[PDB]
Amino acid sequence: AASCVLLHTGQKMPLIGLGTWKSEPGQVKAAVKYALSVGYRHIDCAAIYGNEPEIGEALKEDVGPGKAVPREELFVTSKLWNTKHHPEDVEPALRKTLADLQLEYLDLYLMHWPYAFERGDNPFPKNADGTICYDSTHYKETWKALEALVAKGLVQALGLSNFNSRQIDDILSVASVRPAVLQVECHPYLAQNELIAHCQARGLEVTAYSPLGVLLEEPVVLALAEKYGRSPAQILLRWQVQRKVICIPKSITPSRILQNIKVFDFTFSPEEMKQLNALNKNWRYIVPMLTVDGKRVPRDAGHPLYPFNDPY
Template sequence: MAGAPRGSGGGSEDGHRRGLPPLRLRARVRQREGDRRGRAREDRRGHGEEGGPVHRQQGAWRPLWNTFHRPELVLPACKKTLENFGLDYLDLYLMHWPMAFKEGDESFPTDAEGNFITEDIDYVDTYLAMEECVRQKLTRSIGVSNFNSQQILRVLKASIKPVMNQVECHPYLNQKRLIEFCRARGIQVTGYSPLGAPNTVWAPGAPKLVEDPRLAQLAARLGRSVAQVVLRYLVQNRVIAIPKSTNPTRLKQNISVFDFQLSEEDMEFIDGMNSNTRTCPFFQCKNDKNYPFVGEF
């Protein structure tokens, strides 16, 4: 992960050659279990609560939540994050969404129709304020999350280039064009919900990737789990996958994806499963002018 969370050496040659040091994914898998509750508190209840410690060797990254997009709030929010998690600096600070939410105590301010209440704040202005976090050495690098190609082009006019775009990515939403677009501009891609978020509350009734019989058949032929096949697919597409699990067996499976490869035919087969299906469509913001899931990619 260029200029972002750091590892401490090691990792297979295959992982490095394909753009994803295995240690980074392993650190992410370990971090997701211990860090999940602290991140949820900060993301969804604001930056005023205590967080748990984040271990430096895992790489420390945090998101800037939507209620803190006004430029004057960005630097204080970053400082509060560092205080909450007992850190001197972050390796990566991400703008979580391009939409700005109404400021206040509610992390998800909602109107009578159930839509999130947004504010007219240009995400470019927010990003420019994040640059000051780098200049003050509060974070080593900055990036974005859930940005489309046109939004990234606007941000690239800033002085400090984003090193990362974190987006939903899995076989039902493989993001191939966006990945190519980002990598051509030196931006790494992190894939959240790589297993399709089977228990998501954002898209009830969405098909469950891990139960797809096509993947089950492929996994059985390879002697692997469906999750391992999916994660390997993302690794070979040079995506930094961040699976989430609290099951010890699944955690071990999720990091055991560097001792096999998918053939070109297997990769093309999984490519064919793309249906642009999102498990986190964030429809409650679809009327906001900065809603990212519009256009080609």
């Protein structure tokens, strides 16, 4: 169904992929198989979603040897969690993911966040006040460890997730392996225009998460929906897709799963792209918060390697 982009690896990555972000372990498999049937060849995963094994079983039923879809035809992404930033922990964390997903290698491996959580197995090390027990590993450090992975042949490409421009450059100045993708929150309210351009200048492809960012209730998006016989969500995805931005919409409902991939047989005119382009408000929803005295406060703003303090 989807068309792809070409990564600096030489790898083709479809523009649409299934997000497993909040997929229940129980509902997930059914989702994987359906999407597989419908034309999907890209699945975005994460050890923190805590559903890899379920995903691994679904895959086990359709990919490979005498199966429906051949491994070589699927693009699988995963991510290193915060508590696994120690150079010594990188490899085993990946191997754990590979076991769970039951794969011999990953296509894209991202570093989930630039900053780390206290070294260990509990994914959310907290103090009794609900505050996070951080760690000081520098991402350049974890980065070098990730490189050993591509060399060993456990992953084909490395990526960054939630990294600012400065961050990207920092890693680049030390890298042997250039990061292929940059995964961030992107939608019409958070267009990420400076960052996409930066990524462009640097040789990174951009993958948008939370593409439907009420964004769905915008007259402009409702007009296009009516104009193209499409849903408000397909419009949002078309904008990104057309913009050459890879989207990973997460869903566990067949009807939406189908719709989500069907954004290639139509195109917006320039006045329309402008229309959508006019919605920007530097509006991020995906920010770790904390409730103190009945007020939501940014949760990791004090961390040295925190990404959202810089303008982009």
